[PDB]
Design a protein around this ligand. Sequence first.
Ligand code: FES
Length: 98
Amino acid sequence: ATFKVTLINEAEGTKHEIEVPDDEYILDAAEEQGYDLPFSCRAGACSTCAGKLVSGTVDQSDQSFLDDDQIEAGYVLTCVAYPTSDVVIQTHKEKDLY
Ligand code: FES
């Protein structure tokens, strides 16, 4: 399957839509589609690529940085997240972390 992923940059007031394969991480699909997003480690072990879910679900089983409460709050490391449905997510949310 292929899921629609909506990227929202609150500070910039932008909204971009991408199509993401069920077996591709969101960050990779975004870049391929023309949208560069923040990243550093690209391995699920930092917070640079953090985003926050608005709706939809992801599989980010490979991540290691976020604690359970952060995940509960809707945080996602885009570099290692696969969409599991259509998703609405806010990007550039690193600063929200502590
Ligand atoms: S860039 Fe480090 S966890 Fe995604």
